[PDB]
Design a binder for this molecule. Structure first.
Ligand SMILES: [Ca+2]
Ligand SMILES: [Mn+2]
Ligand SMILES: [Mn+2]
Ligand code: NA
Ligand code: NA
Ligand code: NA
Lengths: 261, 261
């Protein structure tokens, strides 16, 4: 019974037998933001928070703010329209995508040890297959996220981007890794890095394969995910819903996970 | 078992035996925004969406935007710090509150007929108790939302604020209603209007009782909820999570509910 499922869930939430895990980083001026080559493209802006009032002459009984905020800021969601490969989907925007897809079991692939050894670590199809053999098949409509514990760098932007003369160095997936996931008909793929692709994904074929391939198939991306170390490899539910921005290509989100405990 | 519950949930989402309802309105320049008396307070800004690129020379392979965005914009969450009565709660901010509380069963109180006949319709404690008598008691930690079908005016700000010479006219709770809900230890209160209080709440005692009393008790408010007409009175889970804005007083949200079908 669908209803007993929901009531059961409501009770376990209230009792804490199902724990809500906060998978989101702090959104503010110090939030790390993508930096692109300025001869390649314009930058998304840094986050600004402007006071309107704080129990004062501008607003006696209340405190509130407004913001300068890019769609693609902090922990955030990538809609298919965000990439040329997904431009023609009429349901590829934040205000037109199908919300039934947004909530699903999540596969948490732990690559944190590898990531620390090599900042340019790449998750491959063979490695995903190995993970499947240990933990279980990745299923249709499920979330797949790469845990790297990159969020430990979220307090310092330079370290979070981890760039040198050759560019950003941060972990991510190979092109074949993404193709293989898309053959499993997943809903989307997520990272704890600045974007869904490795830092060095500009020199990949195709460039930015996560972005390219995910959106080609009308699938979603998630970036700057926090606290994937508190999720199990299998069995959690990921909730990742963008603001309903008009013709939005993306949005910051409050990524939440449901885990047993 | 919590795990058997989560897996069951996942399966039912996939099969659509559990339906995800979008309770959020579109977030854009035409999104209705609160207007306050100019000799009383500064306003929160209208939403602006600005293009960064759309597969052009500003960004060849991608489309994205940035926004001018008030915390309190469209379908949105009120954190306790928003009111003077909640200013001292250290967990009263979008980034300090307890996400365990954010997902809970929702009581949907249908006031659409009365509201249609009386734009100034007030929901009272007595009316709420009669409601409880028919559908079941309101429980600790639960959401309570007032369905007015006000979202039908969302296409026209003037009709949505519904103001005349004496101010906004839109449905809301009495102080007695809010005081009663608080005795039930609810998590928070939501409306389909521009805010949690009736348009005429300024002349209430105390002024803006929803904002005042909810936040006094470290509770939450939701405003501009869409599609409450798609929800059942009982049995549904509401997910309403704010962006993790640093010291945020509130946030636009992508309100989503889980209903059986
Ligand atoms: Ca390179
Ligand atoms: Mn992005
Ligand atoms: Mn508000
Ligand atoms: Na006031
Ligand atoms: Na402004
Ligand atoms: Na590119």
């Amino acid at each position: 019974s669908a209803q007993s499922a929901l009531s059961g869930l409501g009770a376990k939430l209230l009792s804490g037998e199902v724990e809500v895990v906060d998978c989101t980083g702090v959104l503010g001026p110090n939030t790390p933001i993508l930096q692109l080559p300025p001869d390649f493209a314009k930058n998304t802006p840094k986050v600004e928070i402007h006071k309107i009032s704080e129990y004062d002459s501008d607003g006696p009984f209340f405190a509130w703010n407004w913001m300068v905020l890019g769609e693609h800021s902090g922990t955030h969601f990538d809609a298919p329209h965000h990439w040329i490969t997904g431009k023609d989907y009429s349901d590829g925007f934040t205000d037109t995508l199908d919300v039934q897809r947004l909530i699903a079991p999540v596969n948490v692939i732990d690559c944190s040890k590898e990531s620390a050894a090599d900042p340019d670590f790449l998750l491959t199809a063979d490695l995903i297959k190995a993970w499947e053999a240990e933990h279980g098949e990745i299923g249709a409509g499920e979330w797949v996220v790469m845990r790297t514990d990159w969020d430990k760098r979220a307090g310092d932007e330079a370290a979070f981007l981890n760039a040198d003369e050759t560019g950003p160095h941060s972990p991510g997936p190979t092109p074949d890794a993404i193709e293989y996931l898309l053959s499993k008909k997943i809903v989307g793929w997520g990272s704890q890095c600045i974007g869904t692709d490795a830092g060095q994904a500009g020199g990949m074929e195709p460039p930015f394969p996560a972005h390219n391939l995910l959106h080609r198939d009308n699938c979603f991306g998630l970036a700057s995910l926090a606290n994937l170390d508190k999720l199990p490899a299998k069995g959690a539910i990921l909730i990742a819903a963008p603001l309903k921005i008009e013709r939005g290509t993306g949005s910051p989100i409050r990524a939440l996970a449901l885990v047993p405990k």
